[PDB]
Structure 1
Amino acid sequence: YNFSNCNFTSITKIYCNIIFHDLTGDLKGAKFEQIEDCESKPACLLKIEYYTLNPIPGCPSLPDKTFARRTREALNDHCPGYPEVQNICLQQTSQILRLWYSFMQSPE
């Protein structure tokens, strides 16, 4: 899918006022060095969607986390035609949060 047709303004408002607080709430001050970055909003959304909604070994429940459920819904609602180790969960969550930062700082 190409996230380029997404309503980024709506999505931004959802992230800033909801999803952001969910992510930071789960991390509770824990932080990690980031791994991947992105240079455009569509490209960032692509990484975000993949990291957020595909479960990984050691954190199968990631796509079921509150921040994750809201993300899925935000894309569905605002993008056209869009279809266990705790430390691992946190690590991925930290990555996702930092991708949001890149999203916010990247051009449309």
Structure 2
Amino acid sequence: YNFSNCNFTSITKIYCNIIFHDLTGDLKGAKFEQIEDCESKPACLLKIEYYTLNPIPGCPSLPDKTFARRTREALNDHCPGYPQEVQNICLQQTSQILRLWYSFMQSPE
């Protein structure tokens, strides 16, 4: 999908006022070295979506967490045409996602 048509202003308000708090809330201060970066709002949203809604080995439940469902709903609402478990892995992925949001916030449209 091409995230270039998303309303970034709306998504930003949702991230700043809800999703950000959900992420920091889940991380409880844990952080990990950052693996990837991104340099535009559309490119960051693409990575965010991919990290957030695709399960990974060690944290199958990730796409079902509240911050993930809210991310899905925010993209759905504001992007036209948008379609066991180890806690340390969950945290690692959650930390990556939060930092991709920071990149989103710092990137141009």
Q: 1:5-61 CA deviation, whole Å, 9 max, x = no partner?
A: 000000000000000000000000000010000000000000000000001111000
Q: Distance in 2 between matches of 1:73 and 1:55?
A: 17
Q: Percent identity?
A: 100
Paired residues, number = 108
Instruction: Give the aligned partner of residue 42 of structure 2.
Output: 42
Q: Distance in 2 between matches of 1:106 and 1:38?
A: 8
Q: Distance in 1 between matches of 2:33 and 2:59?
A: 19
Following TM superposition, the consecutive aligned residue runs of length 4 or more in structure 1 with deviations greater than 3 angstroms are none
Q: Distance in 2 between matches of 1:82 and 1:45?
A: 12
Where does the alignment leave 5 or more consecutive residues of structure 2 unmatched?
none
Where does the alignment leave 5 or more consecutive residues of structure 1 unmatched?
none
Deviation at 1:94, TM superposition (A): 0.2
TM-score by length of 1: 0.99
TM-score by length of 2: 0.99
Deviation at 1:75, TM superposition (A): 0.1
